[PDB]
Amino acid sequence: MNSVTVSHAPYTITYHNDWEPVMSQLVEFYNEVASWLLRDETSPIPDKFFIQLKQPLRNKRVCVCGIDPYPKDGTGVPFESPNFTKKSIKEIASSISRLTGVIDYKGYNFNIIDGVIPWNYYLSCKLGETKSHAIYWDKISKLLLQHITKHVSVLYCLGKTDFSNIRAKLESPVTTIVGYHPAARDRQFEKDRSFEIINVLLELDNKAPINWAQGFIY
């Protein structure tokens, strides 16, 4: 819809109107930091940092959140792996396959599920190094996730360590689940039932469940 300019790359940020209330501060915060983060090659590329701000928030009832993008090949859409190559998304798809009974599929994407907004807490990383840009995104990450949590009924974070003390410092009343990361040891993600629990919590808040099968690609 609308656009806003910033003094460093990617220069323009196009945003859906639901994000308006935070854009002014986003610009201030990004300008203060961008120079530091663009030194490094990144995942995703700078033109893709903010494409998830084109998504609406008012139709969203669940946020599924990872700490930062894939160390390589980040597309700007959290969790997205267009050629279905990344371990995280393969493990997620398996979980939902067992849950939904859908056995034959070629990919999975959170971004095409009604009511779900997939999110990366930090919006970039130094290529090949997870959590490398935490110190730069800090204030922005808090700002944007606070805004998301005013719309969604449930926040689902993936990674017990990654999200230990970040969720305590979010200052939001929103119902929160911190589950295992897909690559957690001893198959703990495979025994994790957060996808089911989400729908129970949504039902308790007088909201429709998420149909997790909508994420499949054929």
Query: Rounded to the nearest whole angstrom, what is the least distance from the CB of residue 32 to its own copies in the complex?
Result: 28
What is d(CA 117, CA 152) in angstroms, rounded to the nearest whole number?
9
Residue 184 interaction partner, one of Cl ion, its own copies, none, beta carbon < 5-8 Å per kind: Cl ion
Query: What b/e sequence results for 92-127 when a residue is b if at least 16 CB atoms lie within 10 Å of its CB, and e otherwise?
Result: bbebbbeebebeebebbbbbebebbbbbbbbbbbbb
Three-state SS at 113: coil
Residue 68 is among the residues annotated as catalytic for this protein: yes
- List the x/- string, 159-188, binding to Cl ion by CB under 5 A: xx-------------------xx--x----
Residue 64 and residue 92 in contact, taking contact as beta carbons nearer than 8 Å: no
Task: Compare residues 88 and 146 and give the one whose CB is closer to Cl ion.
Answer: 88
Where does this chain bind its own copies (CB under 8 A)?
168, 173, 175-178, 191, 193, 196-197, 200-201, 203-206
Indicate if the alpha-carbon torsion angle 165, 166, 171, 177 is positive or negative. negative
**Looking at 18, 68, 162, 192, which residue is catalytic?**
68
Which residues here bind Cl ion, judged by CB under 5 A?
Answer: 159-160, 180-181, 184
Catalytic residues: 68
